[PDB]
Amino acid sequence: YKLVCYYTSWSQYREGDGSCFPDALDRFLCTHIIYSFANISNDHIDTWEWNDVTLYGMLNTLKNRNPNLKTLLSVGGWNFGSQRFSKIASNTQSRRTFIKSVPPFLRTHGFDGLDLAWLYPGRRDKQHFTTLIKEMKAEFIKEAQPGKKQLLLSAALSAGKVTIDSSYDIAKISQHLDFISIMTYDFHGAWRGTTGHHSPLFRGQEDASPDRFSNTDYAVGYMLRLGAPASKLVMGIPTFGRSFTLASSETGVGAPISGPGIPGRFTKEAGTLAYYEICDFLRGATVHRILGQQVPYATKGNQWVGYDDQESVKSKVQYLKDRQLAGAMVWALDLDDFQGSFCGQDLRFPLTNAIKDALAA
Amino acid sequence: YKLVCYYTSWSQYREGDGSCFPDALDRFLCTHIIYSFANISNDHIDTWEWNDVTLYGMLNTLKNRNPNLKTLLSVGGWNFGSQRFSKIASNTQSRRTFIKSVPPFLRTHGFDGLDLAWLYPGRRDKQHFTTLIKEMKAEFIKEAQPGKKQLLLSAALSAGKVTIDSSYDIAKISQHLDFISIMTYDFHGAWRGTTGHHSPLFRGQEDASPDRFSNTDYAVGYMLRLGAPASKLVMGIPTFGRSFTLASSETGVGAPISGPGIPGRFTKEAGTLAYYEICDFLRGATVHRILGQQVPYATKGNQWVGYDDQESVKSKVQYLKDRQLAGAMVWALDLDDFQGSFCGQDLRFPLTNAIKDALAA
Amino acid sequence: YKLVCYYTSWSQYREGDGSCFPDALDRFLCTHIIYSFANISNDHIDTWEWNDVTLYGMLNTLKNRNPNLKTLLSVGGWNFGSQRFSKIASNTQSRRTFIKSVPPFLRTHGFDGLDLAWLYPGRRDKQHFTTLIKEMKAEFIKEAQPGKKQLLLSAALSAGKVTIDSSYDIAKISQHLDFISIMTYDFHGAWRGTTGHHSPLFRGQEDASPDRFSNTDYAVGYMLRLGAPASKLVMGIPTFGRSFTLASSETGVGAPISGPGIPGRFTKEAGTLAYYEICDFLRGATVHRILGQQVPYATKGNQWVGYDDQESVKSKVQYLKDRQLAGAMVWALDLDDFQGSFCGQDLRFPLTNAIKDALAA
Amino acid sequence: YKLVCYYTSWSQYREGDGSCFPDALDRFLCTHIIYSFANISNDHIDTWEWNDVTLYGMLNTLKNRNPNLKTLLSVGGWNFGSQRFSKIASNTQSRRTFIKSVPPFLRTHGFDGLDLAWLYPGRRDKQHFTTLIKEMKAEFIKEAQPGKKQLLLSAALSAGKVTIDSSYDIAKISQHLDFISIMTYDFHGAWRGTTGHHSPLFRGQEDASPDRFSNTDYAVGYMLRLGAPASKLVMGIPTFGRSFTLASSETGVGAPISGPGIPGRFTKEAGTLAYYEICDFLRGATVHRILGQQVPYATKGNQWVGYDDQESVKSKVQYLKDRQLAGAMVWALDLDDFQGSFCGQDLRFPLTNAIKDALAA
Ligand SMILES: CC(=O)N[C@@H]1[C@@H](O)[C@@H](O)[C@@H](CO)O[C@H]1O
Ligand SMILES: CC(=O)N[C@@H]1[C@@H](O)[C@@H](O)[C@@H](CO)O[C@H]1O
Numbered sequence A, B, C, D: 001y002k003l004v005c006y007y008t009s010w011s012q013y014r015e016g017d018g019s020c021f022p023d024a025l026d027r028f029l030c031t032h033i034i035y036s037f038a039n040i041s042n043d044h045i046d047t048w049e050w051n052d053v054t055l056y057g058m059l060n061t062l063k064n065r066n067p068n069l070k071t072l073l074s075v076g077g078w079n080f081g082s083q084r085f086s087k088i089a090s091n092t093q094s095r096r097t098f099i100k101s102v103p104p105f106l107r108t109h110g111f112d113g114l115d116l117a118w119l120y121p122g123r124r125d126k127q128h129f130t131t132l133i134k135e136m137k138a139e140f141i142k143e144a145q146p147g148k149k150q151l152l153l154s155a156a157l158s159a160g161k162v163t164i165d166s167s168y169d170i171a172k173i174s175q176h177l178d179f180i181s182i183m184t185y186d187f188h189g190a191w192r193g194t195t196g197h198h199s200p201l202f203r204g205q206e207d208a209s210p211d212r213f214s215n216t217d218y219a220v221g222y223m224l225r226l227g228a229p230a231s232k233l234v235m236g237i238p239t240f241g242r243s244f245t246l247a248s249s250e251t252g253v254g255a256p257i258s259g260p261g262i263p264g265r266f267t268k269e270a271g272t273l274a275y276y277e278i279c280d281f282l283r284g285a286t287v288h289r290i291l292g293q294q295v296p297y298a299t300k301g302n303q304w305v306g307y308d309d310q311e312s313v314k315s316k317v318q319y320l321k322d323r324q325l326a327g328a329m330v331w332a333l334d335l336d337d338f339q340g341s342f343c344g345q346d347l348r349f350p351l352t353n354a355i356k357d358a359l360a361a
């Protein structure tokens, strides 16, 4: 089983014990680690943060004691701009420059691979996206055709039905990619203005979600049906939760909300909490397991958070093993308890370790 | 929380330890016990079996130590002839004689109420059935008018979407009935000529069943939607399994079958097994929990049976409690381990006791 | 001990069995293989031959089956032109561009380091050469400072006293280089217009040479005295001979000549023969061991050639081991009998294997 | 070519097999044999050993079967005293008497000529030596005027540059001498307190000897340069070796010593060893060929000896033939294996037959 794990370069800047650099990662935890993100600039792949070269260094250092570890560089992400990635993929010169720039940059900086994270190609870009992928694989085959270890090509794809239907030719791109990470989290499948979990496994209670699409099971089945081979599909599992401010005494699934949850001290983003933040929040909170969805939420005063814990990630790994998927993708290493000193069990990366042990069973 | 339990009269004729009579029944187990079934003969309510009047008393003796206990007599059943019942409830005199005949016969034989089990009112009968339930509740209010204790009225309704849509005016009859026993088992939800569980709680893997309706969650939600109040709805939990003969080595959900399953020694009905026969079957067998349905099946040799156990009935009780339903209905006392000698715990009614325990916590 | 061996890119064009491509090289033969030469173009390190990129890869493939093997790329050579290397190294901006370009180029194309072959810095360029080496070494230390395998830096240096005195600050460049390959061959030690061996180990007969300086032993000792550590000094051993056309019946050392030797069938360069050509020539030749110089010459008709054989390279290896040098350097693989079919042993790389054997003993 | 061999008269007194007398000598081995040493007493040439006259007889017996063998007697030696030969040679009366005394004594005792072994003239005796040689030769020309066979005049000379510069007018004495024997052994060219070979053919490793001039090639080249005809120069070759006692684990050339080598059983002279003694030593010893010097040393335990073997003496002959020298000189028959029972092969005079063979090839 593959265990693909994202590290985000902006986690370095978080205050205090929140600050995360690649020298804090367990080198035997993951089969693959992906660094996010890289810019594209003058149509060439390029660094993002001032100190990426150092941080690339720290990441690849982990391969010294662990030969099997693979590292990829993810290009794109949320702050990149769907627009900008569009302009580049659609134009024929721009695309060639970009593609031609990739292998030298990866080799120069110690990476085994590229992860395309265009979030997201629009309706207009479906063919461009297929082309980009096909030609990038072609370039990687050429570059290594004299005897080398060939560079890996992956992509992070939406788990949302709408985006999958409009943006991705699944059968075509699946043939050229080495794996697909499906982002089975951040589903927006609650009734407007109410609580719901952002990463249910199963739909659960039929009449308590507006549709059947907003869950891990549906999206995994859909992508399999659309022609992605089970053996190339990696199933995304979050180490963050999505939080809401409650607007009444109701704390169930479907309760009214007034908006996103109060920011965490360290991640400082409304509507999100790192698992290490949730471990703090849980002291004095009530935990409930949403029966049909197989995932927990916690509530304390006017705050509600839907997240994953050791029991839930085990259920998720059972699912992915039963479907013979290739493995699990973890977003993100820097949002697990990587200091091992918030979750009260002195265990670094409790969630990721949980996934790893369930893959072994 | 009501806990409505069905005792069947034909269960007296099973060999050896199979034989069951109202004497073997724990008086504290249930709140309501429902005797099934009664005839309608020449438009008056009648007995069925030769020794019904004895068994009535054996049953109504149990109320001696227990004044909280209620009993009800169910009239109808599968053998009745759905034809015959429709005739009776369409004709204006028939219905009048019938309704008039019930209250004396009930007080006489010691019953606290009637349970309607017309299986099933078809197309045409929707209004007849609505009226029958309306005028029967008219009679039971008139009968107890001199300060008696009003007779209870209830009905066993289908959990099948088709049958509910064609047969029941749930908004109307729910105002007249005291509770509704919704038969959330014997779904026909599997792909054709393949294995499936007959009483799943949730739909489960979205791509592994033809429809979203053949599960307990759907049925309960549907009825809540159609007008039935939560405080009048009692959720059916089976103490029996449905079995199949497999046709290949595949033993999963949706494995090819060739027909129903070898009959039990004591129940002697192909495709059925009492819980106590299942305990016999389990020794030697692989149990697997269906992940999204939250129910087990067992397979051994060319036999596959989907059944409910202590873990699974507690989940269903957690489900019914979370929806604030009236309580749980059990089909049937004579099919749980009533000896206490099969399931190796030396415990009478393991499944029914699991349901009681969970209801109180 | 190191065994550094040069492969020359232009050897690929030699007719017939002379043609040598990197895939003919024994992957277990040498510790370090150096590819010569790379261009510098627009102050950037660059390819020379149109197929360099294919040949780099056939070389680097040799590492798959033997990971210990190291590869370096040599920049410069005799066709480069000393005066064009001057301007690059002496302009501060050219030199930075160049130095900046090397590590990406090396990593992109699979090489473990750079070999400098400036042939040769004049008196004017001594300091420039020193500076070039210091800065170039600093860059490799920087590029690697986060946990990479650091890039090797080596230099092919002249064994000629006059060039060493004019061009090299030995003490300073020795601390920065990882090894020095001293080109202890092609000495111009013969009395003008007379036969002499181009790679004597010692001076031999005192009154039969012009100078005491044109011999391996002098050049080694001189570099040691000047500050090159033994542990960084690699001693060049030729797999080629230098040939003369005799002008009389005299056939000894110091016999009159009329010009360089007739070209070989395959190397096609007057005054030079590959070892495999020498094997052909030895058929009907007389060989003599030069008494003080520990090396052979052969003569046949009007031709005379001073070369190395298995015995003579063995002696050279004894010598370098007794001086505790870092190992042997071989110019060049493509001039050894790489085919194995010329020296009537059916044994590929006869000279280099002999060198290898003597280093291991 | 000439082959000039010394027998030493004091070799009779050595124990057992060590004992050597002229009857032990093959008569076909040498072209000249030189009996050493004779005395000068009361300014007349005398005998030295009590039995000299017998030994001279046995020696001269050898010419009975061999018409071509030539014998000479050698006045002087180390034990004569430089101080005393000076006084005989510097006084016009002394010297005239000596000269005149010489021919009759030589005719009387069977000798074909005289060999001068003044070891050695000082600065102050240079011109006296020139005058002795000139006058002695004038005498021998005059004594032969009655149609006799002219007596042979030869001289043994130092190979050391200092002695040559102080003592010898090579150009002048060369015309009067029939041959010069150059003593190209017993060189004092080890760094002080260290091992060195006493008879190297060439200088060898440039920085592993104090001086350029303690070797055979330099001595020969120097004499030629000072005006000795090649056709009169006989190059000395030793059959003994010189031995040290090591002071350390180091056994190489220039290793630390503590004093001379353990005396041999038969020679009893610290720091010397006959070849027959060396043949025993070799059993259990390591032999190394010194690359520069074309000569072996042997070490075993705390002992180290530099000697000449069959290989080394063949090379010394090659050198003398290439330089067109008159022939070889051997010191000495009694230090070679004259028994023929020490060196394994059952051959008498291994080293001297080696010389002879090489002179004939
Ligand atoms: C610096 C960076 O990460 N992003 C730049 C962005 O700032 C913008 O200027 C663009 C050109 O319009 O190039 C991008 O890569
Ligand atoms: C099973 C049973 O009790 N059936 C009776 C029987 O008398 C039957 O013949 C019918 C007459 O039409 O009436 C039913 O109530």
Ligand SMILES: CC(=O)N[C@@H]1[C@@H](O)[C@@H](O)[C@@H](CO)O[C@H]1O
Residues within 6 Å of the ligand: C039, C040, C041, C047, C048
């Ligand atoms: C062999 C080679 O590639 N060398 C080029 C040469 O082609 C030429 O253009 C020169 C211009 O001054 O630059 C060199 O590097």
Ligand SMILES: CC(=O)N[C@@H]1[C@@H](O)[C@@H](O)[C@@H](CO)O[C@H]1O
Residues within 6 Å of the ligand: D039, D040, D041, D042, D046, D047, D048, D049
């Ligand atoms: C007898 C002999 O062999 N040697 C003597 C020596 O002993 C010494 O007496 C000298 C004159 O003082 O004359 C030498 O020839």
